[PDB]
Symmetry: C2
Subunit: 162 residues, 2 copies
């Protein structure tokens, strides 16, 4: 027996869909820069454009893996030093991320999740999902400043009109 998608889950998913679409637009935007430009350290967040994108991807997937209760296994930025490799990494985890989100879509939103990198700490599914959502929008906001510093128009962050 199947149930209709609950409103809470649809509202949370709209943020994910928004984030993923915006991210893809930043990947396209990054194509106009050299790998040196993409890797150049600047002030703010995790300091370079390419590592910011990697970091977003990394953190999102690490929390989704914690929700699944799988072993940590942290991908290393050293193995993803180009726009194409970071874009491929984003694609590699997407289907797993979607399946996990769908699998944890019920009304038991205070489901407890153990944090492999914090001994004796638990967060709820609800907390983690809010955190993941805010995390990407936050780092993407940082990219928009560096975009104007490079004298380039940023990708729009508007939720409406998508």
């Amino acid at each position: 027996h199947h149930h209709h998608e609950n409103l809470y889950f649809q509202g949370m998913m709209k943020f994910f869909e928004y984030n993923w679409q915006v991210r893809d637009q930043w990947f396209t935007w990054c194509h106009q820069l050299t790998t040196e430009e993409l890797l150049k350290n600047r002030l703010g967040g995790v300091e370079n454009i390419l590592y910011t994108l990697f970091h977003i991807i990394d953190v999102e997937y690490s929390w989704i893996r914690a929700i699944q209760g799988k072993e940590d296994i942290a991908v290393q930025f050293a193995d993803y030093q180009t726009l194409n490799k970071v874009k491929s990494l984003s694609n590699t985890f997407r289907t797993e991320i979607i399946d996990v989100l769908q699998t944890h879509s019920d009304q038991i939103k205070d489901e407890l999740v153990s944090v492999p990198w914090e001994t004796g700490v638990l967060y709820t599914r609800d907390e983690i999902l809010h955190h993941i959502i805010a995390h990407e929008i936050h780092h993407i906001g940082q990219l928009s400043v560096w975009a104007r510093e490079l004298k380039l128009s940023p990708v729009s962050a508007s939720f409406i009109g998508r």
Copy 2:
């Protein structure tokens, strides 16, 4: 009488507002260490200065909430709020009204956009993302000023419920 039951959707969206309001208030506190020069200085990215970024965040949020409420307002002019204290007071004034609108439980027309109507849900998503986006811009400027930005972490933060304001 009738049995109640918690609105999971509603509480889910409110945790973003709670997070945003707490983060914003910490940025208002962060701004006290800056000079009026540093606060108003034009920088690259977004709406270009720290004080105007905070003003823009509160203006956009209140305008949409007012659209949801069905009420229209005369544009608040940044020229009338050129100090940190004035922008903080405006933030608190708008918040009082916003809490009432969120605590009350159709399609929303906007005075600016003719021929389009939005769901309340669409608007809440837009408001939430809009603040987090601009706040992200402030963290870059913070590091450019050789200052530590305010935390953006959702996790590990005690959220004050909307009803506790």
